[PDB]
Ligand binder design. Structure first.
Ligand SMILES: [Ca+2]
Ligand SMILES: [Ca+2]
Lengths: 185, 183
């Protein structure tokens, strides 16, 4: 093959591979549309699940206590605070890549005045996170002398390496029932 | 008890329906991959013809690949000189598995015209390869283990890194690795 002919072939290959890239980019769009369709399709069922969960005392504290990774993040008084956690929600943003948000809904409690505690994650791919400010009632669990579970809300250094955020989103939220249930004899 | 064990049963029923919706999404996504597999196939075909006009295309692609480069010994590169064509075929239903074909020209190392390794899913991950008919005094028996031992490795069938790298990374776009920027 000629020295020119090879560079002609390389030019042809580049043109063929641009169309394969186009075909790949169009497939990954169609796939994201399918995820967006089933995100809305599942959301009423998660809505139904939350209502049933809210009639089960200590559901979410128990799931967390029996989870192999999250259990180690809970102190003694953290569990007392999580008693008041009635509802956990996870919301992927529409385009999915943008990021996701996690909501912890609390009943009136001795620790803080917030009705909801949230932590959201954002992505070019520049990982960031931002949380609601916890209005503690002169009983901050993070300024008492182990590190409290609730410091997670004020931690933003890892952002893209937020392990707990990923475990709640990918593991606990899809199926919390496995951890709540304890096999008896 | 009446309430909790009923609620636990209700929760299980709702999550059974979520699993059903998940299974229905993974079907619809599988249809999209099958549609675009057929659309890409004529372009891979034309690419194959253009590649066969390029000496040492696949050896160079492998040598410049961050993971596969470490799998090549010195004499492995000499053998891969004769690799004219690489093909990847996902089976129609996708779940069944896929096959990778390596087409060689007549070479001093083995008599095979094609070397293949296919991956299958009872539903246990499995793989099978063509038997390499090495010639007298050329083999994989001694660098670390030769590149060609990949063909005879079948323990981690579901965890075949090289197979997944070729299928998902190198096969879609080998040109990026062949091309080296000059200044
Ligand atoms: Ca359990
Ligand atoms: Ca390159």
């Amino acid at each position: 093959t000629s020295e020119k002919e090879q560079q002609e072939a390389i030019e042809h290959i580049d043109e063929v591979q641009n169309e394969i890239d186009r075909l790949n980019e169009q497939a990954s769009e169609e796939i994201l549309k399918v995820e967006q369709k089933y995100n809305k399709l599942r959301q009423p069922f998660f809505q139904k699940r939350s209502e049933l969960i809210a009639k089960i005392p200590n559901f979410w504290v128990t799931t967390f206590v029996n989870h192999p990774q999250v259990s180690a993040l809970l102190g003694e008084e953290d569990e007392e605070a999580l008693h008041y956690l009635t509802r956990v929600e996870v919301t992927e943003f529409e385009d999915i890549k943008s990021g996701y948000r996690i909501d912890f809904y609390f009943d009136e409690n001795p620790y803080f005045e917030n009705k909801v505690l949230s932590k959201e994650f954002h992505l070019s791919g520049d990982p960031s996170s931002k949380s609601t400010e916890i209005k503690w009632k002169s009983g901050k669990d993070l300024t008492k002398r182990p590190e409290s579970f609730f410091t997670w809300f004020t931690d933003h250094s890892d952002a893209g390496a937020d392990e707990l955020g990923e475990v709640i989103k990918d593991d606990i939220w899809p199926n919390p029932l496995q951890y709540y249930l304890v096999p008896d004899m």
